[PDB]
Design a protein around this ligand. Structure first.
Ligand SMILES: [Mg+2]
Ligand SMILES: [Mg+2]
Lengths: 55, 55, 171, 67, 72, 98, 104
RNA sequence: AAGGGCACCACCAGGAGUGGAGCCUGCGGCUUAAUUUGACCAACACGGGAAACCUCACCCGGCCCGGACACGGACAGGAUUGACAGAUUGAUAGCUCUUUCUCGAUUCCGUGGGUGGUGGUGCAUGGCCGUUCUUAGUUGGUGGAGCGAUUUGUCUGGUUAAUUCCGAUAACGAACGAGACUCUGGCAUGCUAACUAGUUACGCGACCCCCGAGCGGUCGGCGUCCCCCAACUUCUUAGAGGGACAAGUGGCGUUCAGCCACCCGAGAUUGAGCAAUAACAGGUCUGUGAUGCCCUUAGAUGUCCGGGGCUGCACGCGCGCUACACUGACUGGCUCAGCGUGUGCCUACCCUACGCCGGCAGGCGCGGGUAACCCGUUGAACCCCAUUCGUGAUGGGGAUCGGGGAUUGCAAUUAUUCCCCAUGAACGAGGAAUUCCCAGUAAGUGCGGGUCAUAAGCUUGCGUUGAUUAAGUCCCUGCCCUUUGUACACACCGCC
């Protein structure tokens, strides 16, 4: 809570610096093509984004 | 005693809840609101600041 | 250019924007007969078209809600003033919009209509508006612990192949 | 649970009365017994605190100590 | 391709190129009297092998091979 | 909870310049994306507008990771008697060139 | 001025891209401006392979998601100035354009 | 219980294997402060779960409220807010203490009421997914039988991948599923085109030649949209098309549905995606600002920070990698790919050409590329050609362990990774058992992507080399249908 150590731990990388852009989850994140999207969330919005199962 | 050492049931068809069973049972046959039906159911600020700081 | 972005990331970014815009509009205009959104993007400006059954409600008083929504999406997405637009359009044959029908079931079931009464009412409406077939499924728990699923189907229904993609509307 | 330590008591401020650390003598002669912060951001309003071996500004006018 | 595929491509392209050149510029009656030897020796000398490859599936290491399954 | 007065008036005057205001749900962002030159972070924007919402002056909607606070007619007059505005000055969404 | 322009067309669906390419070429031919036939870059295939299940249970069934990007280059060479000659883009949703100088 | 049918998640005939060894990893157990946790064909390289921090949910400690709002108190004569120096603490947490300043209605205390939770319940739920099942099954209308629920249609038989069709036929005509469909691969010297793909021809070149080749040979050398200063699309790419239908011939069959062979043909069965009625108290509340209820909520199960743990080992099991060698290992030379990635809102992190330094891991400056423009003609590996080794736990195998050098990161110890020099362990083809598999397949072999600040023994795809056996059956293992029995219908996990 004190400004010295409320956020002091560096998070410029690693699995904790990256969260899903939809639900802020930190597991199964897809960063390919800059998606930055949680995995189950991507399946939900797959057609909305434009991805289509062809084969 | 209904579980094994891990904690998985040895009888999934033997409902461990007294209120409900494996097969859903209609309350009052499906009558009343908030319930499945029956056959009977089937049938400007910036300019204001400008004048304020003008003088 | 280096300031520009690769085409693959550009099209991904557009799909993300469309999905978030549609999700936001769904959570916003759910009670206002939301149907869908269509966006036409040009490098000069972008147009947003909200398809909805009740434009009289999506539009605000003297257009208040449209100006309000186009402002809030401009602040969110960082668009310039003249590069963002917001139009509301009615949906013809609303009985053929699975999103709109699923919204009316939500309204009826929230009020407290019987599941059979509401589902058969919408079933007759969709067939009346003209469709080869339709199918509504309601699942969950009502007044009891054990959950049940009811299915109400009539007419023709396809499931397989490419034609399920552009013949059946699902919501 | 079952904390081996006991509950920690948070600080309670002394709730002292009005400042009254500068007076006037002989029908009015202003006299301050507290140092002044001269920094541009510190301003003239703040009064440097007095300690037994140092002086510390109310804001961060650093700390002037004598060795 | 690889070494063998480039070998077969070379020998097959030589046969096809000579046959086509012979067809375009001299009599095809005498094209037949060398084409018949070509087809009676190896049909692959003038017809490409249609088989290319098969896509891998997500159940095993290869297209048709599956991973080991264990019951106990 | 605690804000400097300059932060509170700056947040309110943006909420009255236009009836809407967005904020990414990130309490640790050093500054709000808008009005960052007022040196007030996204955290103070968050709690100030949840307190407006609890009092009913603002209606709140939440998309993926952003808030979409709106200004209500009830909250319009409350902002007038807080920021001392006469009954003529209106936000942009309420009136534009009319 | 003698100016040449390079109009590049990018889309996700081919029917719209072929339509906007067709009536742009027809517009150029109607304007007697010499034009190259639209050259097609190979389609960029954005392939993603996630898992169908949202948990760890299942038969390890993977879902394959495909996106296709189609890109076309159309070359215009007018002896006079060209921007004032052609001013209509005749675009449809889903496809974007970009204008570049042939020398740039 | 009987009868038919089908299937390399069944067998036959075989291939490669696993189970035997070392090691990586995941379970169980043991230990521990914690070794977080779900899952027991259809869990066990699974939660995209390759965790140093974060992740993190577990343990040991310590900050903060980020407890809205309403009411009542206190308060501009001060509600309250931060803090230098010392002690104090892991901490430069004013956390606490001495210490006085400063902050100025923003708070503080009490009473209600929020709020949050990777906390519980998947046996309260949604959604998604897995399986039965990707087998071939499923349901109306009219008509016939029935008092009726119901039945026939949906069947003895032939055929098919398929209730797929043909046929008998109280059924006739349909619908879903199957098929069809979309994508993909193979072919079009046919069309459209291309300095971000080129190919031929030609002009300068550079070398080999001169026995003379001379319109000689090689060039991934320079050029011909450097716009007047060549053409064309064969190769590359991608669009509209075409092309294949059991279509032609012979044979088998009720000579019908179809089956076998053969000619011409690129192809005479290319792989996928989608996928019915329903069931599984199947898995997920640890994907979500999906969610009911319960629990906690200021000494917090919230949130942040530090450290440890998730790796720990008498042992058992599962997916794997490397091997046991000469069909080989080492050394050198030669030489061929295609998927596909690449500079970021937050986000601080890109792919790499060239030169110089080092033996290497690497470092230092120049650039190119937001990309058919640069990496890149992706000079890949196996393989091929030569040399050494010579049946020896051997120059096989590289575990374990010592010393040293770098890179990534705030931090490398419980070794992150990589490199160098040393030790050289089991392992000499592996019991009972067991898995996968029919053509560019298995298998050998490397390469991208996902994970990623650092990272692959995993996975997802790609390409290279490239087979043995079989065109069958119900013996084993299952599953489906028909008949049959039933005191079951919450449906055998039944009833009793
Ligand atoms: Mg099909
Ligand atoms: Mg050694």
């Amino acid at each position: 809570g004190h400004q010295q150590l409320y956020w002091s731990h560096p998070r410029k990388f690693g699995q904790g610096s990256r969260s899903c852009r939809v639900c802020s989850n930190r597991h199964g994140l897809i960063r390919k093509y800059g998606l930055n999207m949680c995995r189950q969330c991507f399946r939900q919005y797959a057609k909305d984004i434009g991805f289509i199962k062809l084969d | 005693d209904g579980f094994d050492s891990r904690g998985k049931r040895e009888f999934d068809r033997h409902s461990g809840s007294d209120r409900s069973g494996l097969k859903h049972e209609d309350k009052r046959g499906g009558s009343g609101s908030h319930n499945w039906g029956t056959v009977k159911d089937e049938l400007t600020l910036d300019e204001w600041k400008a004048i304020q700081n003008k003088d | 250019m280096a300031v520009q972005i690769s085409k693959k990331r550009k099209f991904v970014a557009d799909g993300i924007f469309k999905a978030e815009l549609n999700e936001f509009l769904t959570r916003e205009l759910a009670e206002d007969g939301y149907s869908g959104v269509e966006v036409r993007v040009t490098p000069t400006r972008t147009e947003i078209i909200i398809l909805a059954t009740r434009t009289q409600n999506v539009l605000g008083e003297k257009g208040r809600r449209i100006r309000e929504l186009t402002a809030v999406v401009q602040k969110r997405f960082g668009f310039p003033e003249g590069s963002v637009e917001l139009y509301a359009e009615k949906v013809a044959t609303r009985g053929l919009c699975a999103i709109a029908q699923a919204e009316s079931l939500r309204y009826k079931l929230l009020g407290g209509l019987a599941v059979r009464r509401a589902c058969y009412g919408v079933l007759r409406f969709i067939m009346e508006s003209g469709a080869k077939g339709c199918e509504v499924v309601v699942s969950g728990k009502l007044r009891g612990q054990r959950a049940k699923s009811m299915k109400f189907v009539d007419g023709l229904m396809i499931h397989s192949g490419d034609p399920v993609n552009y013949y059946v509307d699902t919501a | 649970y079952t904390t081996p330590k006991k509950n920690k008591h948070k600080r309670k401020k002394v709730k002292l009365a009005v400042l009254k650390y500068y007076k006037v003598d002989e029908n009015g002669k202003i006299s301050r017994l507290r140092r002044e912060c001269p920094s541009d951001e510190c301003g003239a309003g703040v009064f440097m605190a007095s300690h037994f071996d140092r002086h510390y500004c109310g804001k961060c006018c650093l700390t002037y100590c004598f060795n | 391709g690889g070494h063998v595929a480039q070998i077969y491509a070379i020998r097959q392209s030589i046969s096809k190129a000579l046959v086509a050149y012979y067809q375009k510029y001299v009599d095809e009656a005498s094209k037949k009297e060398i084409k018949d030897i070509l087809i009676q020796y190896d049909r692959t000398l003038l017809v490409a092998d249609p088989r290319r490859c098969e896509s891998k599936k997500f159940g095993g290491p290869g297209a048709r091979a599956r991973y080991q399954k264990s019951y106990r | 909870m605690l804000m400097p007065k300059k932060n509170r008036i700056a947040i309110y005057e943006l909420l009255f310049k236009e009836g809407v205001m967005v904020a990414k749900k990130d309490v640790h962002m050093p500054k709000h994306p808008e009005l960052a030159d007022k040196n007030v972070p996204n955290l103070h924007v968050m709690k100030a507008m949840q307190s407006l919402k609890s009092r009913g002056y603002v209606k709140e909607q939440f998309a993926w990771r952003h808030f979409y606070w709106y200004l209500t007619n009830e909250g319009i007059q409350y902002l007038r008697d807080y920021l001392h505005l006469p009954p003529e000055i209106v936000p942009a969404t309420l009136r534009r060139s009319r | 001025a003698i100016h040449r322009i390079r109009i590049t067309l990018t889309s996700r669906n081919v029917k719209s891209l072929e339509k906007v390419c067709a009536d742009l070429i027809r517009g150029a031919k109607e304007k007697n401006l010499k034009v190259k036939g639209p050259v097609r870059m190979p389609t960029k295939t954005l392939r993603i392979t996630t898992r169908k299940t949202p948990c760890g249970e299942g038969s390890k069934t993977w879902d394959r998601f495909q996106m296709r990007i189609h890109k076309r280059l159309i070359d215009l060479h007018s002896p006079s100035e060209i921007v004032k000659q052609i001013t209509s883009i005749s675009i449809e949703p889903g496809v974007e354009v970009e204008v570049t100088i042939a020398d740039a």
